[PDB]
Symmetry: C2
Subunit: 337 residues, 2 copies
């Protein structure tokens, strides 16, 4: 049995964070400058008590209307998120019931960020190709908005909330539909993208709530996300092209045979810099986050969904998916869609 | 000619923290619960407790160190890390990413955390088998670690007599042979069980509030707040008696495996009362049904690997033995698999 991506559905929340609203709040960053630097026109923001699991539920509901998978067919749920409902129970467990998925389905949460979709795909494929599941519902959902400091311009210009639902199912055929994979993990990158306080390394205290303004005027606490953009970019340029070359070597595949290199949609500056260093033509390199921003684990499936809708992704197309970010963590895989 | 890669358990190592919470100390804290009564009801004499700033990942780190010291695998061979925990270091980044680095594991290793509880090990095994047998990894380091102690209310007798902290490291490697060494699996999830085993407040569904810090006393005189673990023992027990025997039956049927061919039924080591009820309902003989948590208590995802480690230490687990592993708990979530050790 060969694992294949059967179908994808995305969901973005209602509230829009526009560049014009960010410009009102940050004088030094007008709409044209934010767009110039990031390529992001707007991000969607989850309602105040709307969680990542809620966005994933909506994504799954949308998926289940499309004609490839429904609740009754799901026999494993993987929720990739970095904003779960509880420390316990597992958010995927409640999504199982909420979606009407059968009680004989597996369910678990995975904590990864912008690498999470590719990793999720490797788990789903492992489950399908070992006969542990015939239909893995891979969910990604994030609400980074809930831990961005209001005066942290660097992250509020980038991050949007969102979710996706992908069905990975047992198919039969001669071609590998998902894989092979290359993985990466480098925990030295931890301090460059981190919410330091609020779980078990550092519980919340008087100190963790203490605000602190950086060189660029960005205010933060240990309870909010800290992103070292310069470090993350350095990491990305160092590791992603490397992983792409290694993945091609692993697969015995010339780079000309790849129809599309779909990268985690970090922002237009990062993607341009990666595209240039990777020598990939723009027509093989979608940049599709203008209206949703960086949705963390959902960037890839949202991109793929858009590509299907706009006619640029069709069955039999040879893709490279590349996810990279917080951890540090990164992963790539080939897909024969 | 050549045999496909088979995921097998190369080795297991456990780590428990230093501090011991004994029945005698519990009997001082809860005057109406003498040591002998705690023992009769739970079959647990001691639990280990993580130091105040020691996290589950820290415990996992030491389990992994001990595993490499046992010599079946080394850090340099690890190409994937799965940490199963419900007390991670941060909301982000992933605690597995930091363990990768701390353990000196190569950066081409995959790493991720899984949130599950007492079902976690069997689920973990399914993921590790998936990675190994699809060729995505040759040596998956499956870590379990929990520090439930950190969210037990001091006056919640029900949970404090049960739970211990701990971790384990399992090396799941590619063997090559005729026998499926890990699998098949049966899975279960039932989110209706959510309210019966839960830490309500502190993450994104219910942020901490004035009310979540308010203590309340329940029907049994146990005190907690919504920021602490709530466990409805009655419901969890009823769930366990309903699903675990069904899961076991379902698994054997799926595997075409007669019940008699299982050498050992290794169940999540919830406590003696639960395990006794399950053994009797499942009609399994005592010698095929280890109860091995007297000195560590219920260590959540680590119950199974710690039990397996103990069986190896005392010579009741050997290569070639046919096991059923059953994990079941918070979620609700449960899972079973067969193992040819």
């Amino acid at each position: 049995p060969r694992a294949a991506i059967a179908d994808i559905a995305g969901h973005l929340p209602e509230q829009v964070l526009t560049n014009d609203v960010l410009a009102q709040l940050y004088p030094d960053w007008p709409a044209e400058k934010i767009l110039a630097k990031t390529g992001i026109r707007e991000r969607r923001i989850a309602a105040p008590r709307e969680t990542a699991a809620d966005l994933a539920y909506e994504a799954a509901r949308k998926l289940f209307a499309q004609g490839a998978v429904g609740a009754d067919q799901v026999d494993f749920v993987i929720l990739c998120t970095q904003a779960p409902d509880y420390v316990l129970p597992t958010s995927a467990c409640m999504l199982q019931h909420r979606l009407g998925i059968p009680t004989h389905a597996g369910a678990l949460d995975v904590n990864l960020g912008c690498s999470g979709y590719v990793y999720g795909l490797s788990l789903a494929k492992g489950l399908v190709e070992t006969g542990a599941a015939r239909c893995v519902l891979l969910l990604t959902a994030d609400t980074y908005s809930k831990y961005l400091h209001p005066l942290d311009k660097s992250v509020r210009t980038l991050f949007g909330d969102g979710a996706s639902a992908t069905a990975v199912i047992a198919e039969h055929g001669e071609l590998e539909r998902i894989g092979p994979f290359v993985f990466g993990t480098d925990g030295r990158g931890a301090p460059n993208l981190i919410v330091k306080a609020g779980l078990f390394r550092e519980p919340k205290s008087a100190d963790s709530a203490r605000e602190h303004e950086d060189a660029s005027g960005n205010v933060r606490t240990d309870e909010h996300l800290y992103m070292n953009g310069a470090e993350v970019m350095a990491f990305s340029l160092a590791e992603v092209p490397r992983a792409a070359d290694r993945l091609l070597a692993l697969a015995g595949e010339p780079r000309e045979n790849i129809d599309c290199f779909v990268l985690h949609q970090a922002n237009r500056f990062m993607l341009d810099a990666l595209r240039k260093k990777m020598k990939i033509p723009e027509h093989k390199f979608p940049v599709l986050m203008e209206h949703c921003g960086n949705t963390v684990s959902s960037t890839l499936p949202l991109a793929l969904e858009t590509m299907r809708a706009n006619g640029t992704l069709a069955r039999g197309m040879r893709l490279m998916l590349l996810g990279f970010g917080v951890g540090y963590s990164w992963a790539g895989c080939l897909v024969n869609f």
